[PDB]
Amino acid sequence: VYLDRKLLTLEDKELGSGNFGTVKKGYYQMKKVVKTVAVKILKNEANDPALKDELLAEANVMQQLDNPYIVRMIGICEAESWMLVMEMAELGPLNKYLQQNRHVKDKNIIELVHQVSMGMKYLEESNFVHRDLAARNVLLVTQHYAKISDFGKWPVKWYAPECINYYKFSSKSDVWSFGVLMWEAFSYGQKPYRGMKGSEVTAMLEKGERMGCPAGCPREMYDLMNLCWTYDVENRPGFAAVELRLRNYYYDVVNH
Ligand SMILES: Cc1ccc(NC(=O)c2cccc(C(F)(F)F)c2)cc1-c1cc2cnc(Nc3ccccc3)nc2n(C)c1=O
């Protein structure tokens, strides 16, 4: 639950930078072995007791969410600053990985997005709405093991129309984001709606227009992105339906 700072070694290089924290790679001593971890060090400049409350609440939320397809919590550590200790996904975000590894097979991409649907089906079942599902928020443990993470101005290009218009956030608006995620993945981490303003994307979507099928993307997978992009929220699938369609496809295509 609560970790001993003496058992925690921090590297001075930053994996992430933010207004309320700095992420650093570390090592947590465990009897015989040492476990590589990612550490959010609370930056409370600031200087409120509610910021610490938020970190402790996130820790409680994370404790409840236990699934192999989400960045899992190791524990909390109170030292020079408050620290949240998480497992390390050594390859970093899915977008950057794919921009540098054009050799990734489309069979390997089906497996990754299915794993993302599995973790999102879990979050849906636990009544948890992500709100920032994108490729940059999918971190790789290995090339065959994806984990969902969550690191004013909004990520409009991943937003469902009911989020832009009425601020209605649900698991079904996370489904829309999943479809933008799938597009980013088969496009080898290229930016969705490249060079468009958020306002331009809203207008395009209202004309019934959607992003084209990436090069080499299987047709069944593009058909699924399009169903994730259903304008009417009531007709849009949930993650139970999405995961089941990806599971079947993985069972058919990837078995070997
Ligand atoms: C350090 C850290 C603290 C907290 C979180 N939070 C979550 O993952 C989270 C919070 C709420 C909901 C959910 C959801 F349930 F939806 F999943 C997740 C994440 C981190 C954290 C972990 C992490 C793991 N690996 C890497 N790898 C990496 C490698 C190369 C370059 C960049 C990153 N990075 C991580 N980072 C940056 C983290 O912040």
Swiss-Prot record:
Gene this protein is translated from: SYK
The UniProt similarity line reads: Belongs to the protein kinase superfamily. Tyr protein kinase family. SYK/ZAP-70 subfamily.
Q: Which UniProt keywords apply?
A: Adaptive immunity, Angiogenesis, ATP-binding, Cell membrane, Cytoplasm, Disease variant, Host-virus interaction, Immunity, Innate immunity, Kinase, Membrane, Nucleotide-binding, Phosphoprotein, Repeat, SH2 domain, Transferase, Tyrosine-protein kinase, Ubl conjugation
Q: How does it assemble?
A: Interacts with LYN; phosphorylates SYK. Interacts with RHOH (phosphorylated); regulates mast cells activation. Interacts with NFAM1 (phosphorylated); probably involved in BCR signaling. Interacts with VAV1 (via SH2 domain); phosphorylates VAV1 upon BCR activation. Interacts with GAB2 (phosphorylated); probably involved in IgE Fc receptor signaling. Interacts (via its SH2 domains) with CD79A (via its phosphorylated ITAM domain); the interaction stimulates SYK autophosphorylation and activation. Interacts with FCRL3. (Microbial infection) Interacts with Epstein-Barr virus LMP2A.
Quote one Gene Ontology molecular function term: SH2 domain binding
Name the record gives this protein: Tyrosine-protein kinase SYK
Does the keyword Ubl conjugation belong to this entry? Answer: yes
Where in or outside the cell it occurs: the entry states: Cell membrane; Cytoplasm, Cytosol
Residues with PTM Phosphotyrosine: Y2, Y122, Y145, Y166, Y249, Y250, Y251
Is GTP-binding a UniProt keyword of this protein? no
Task: Summarize the protein's role.
Answer: Non-receptor tyrosine kinase which mediates signal transduction downstream of a variety of transmembrane receptors including classical immunoreceptors like the B-cell receptor (BCR). Regulates several biological processes including innate and adaptive immunity, cell adhesion, osteoclast maturation, platelet activation and vascular development. Assembles into signaling complexes with activated receptors at the plasma membrane via interaction between its SH2 domains and the receptor tyrosine-phosphorylated ITAM domains.
Q: How is it modified after translation?
A: Ubiquitinated by CBLB after BCR activation; which promotes proteasomal degradation.
Q: Per its UniProt record, which disorder involves this protein?
A: Immunodeficiency 82 with systemic inflammation: An autosomal dominant immunologic disorder with onset in early childhood. It is characterized by recurrent infections with various organisms, and multi-organ inflammation that manifests as colitis, hepatitis, arthritis and dermatitis. Patients have a propensity for the development of lymphoma, usually in adulthood. Disease severity is variable.
> Which GO terms are recorded in the biological process aspect for this UniProt protein?
adaptive immune response; amyloid-beta clearance; angiogenesis; animal organ morphogenesis; apoptotic signaling pathway; B cell differentiation; B cell receptor signaling pathway; beta selection
GO CC annotations on file: B cell receptor complex; cytoplasm; cytosol; early phagosome; nucleus; plasma membrane; protein-containing complex; T cell receptor complex
Q: Can you give the residue ranges of the Protein kinase domain?
A: 9-251
Sequence positions that bind ATP: L15, G16, S17, G18, N19, F20, G21, T22, V23, K40
Know anything about its domains from the record?
The SH2 domains mediate the interaction of SYK with the phosphorylated ITAM domains of transmembrane proteins. Some proteins like CLEC1B have a partial ITAM domain (also called hemITAM) containing a single YxxL motif. The interaction with SYK requires CLEC1B homodimerization.
| Outcome of swapping S170Y | In IMD82; constitutively active protein tyrosine kinase activity
Q: In which tissues is it expressed?
A: Widely expressed in hematopoietic cells (at protein level). Expressed in neutrophils (at protein level). Within the B-cell compartment, expressed from pro- and pre-B cells to plasma cells.
Sites bearing Phosphothreonine, chain numbering: T22, T202
Q: Which cysteines are joined by disulfide bonds?
A: none
Classification from the root reads:
Eukaryota, Metazoa, Chordata, Craniata, Vertebrata
**Active site (catalytic residues):** D132
Residues bearing Phosphoserine are S17, S199
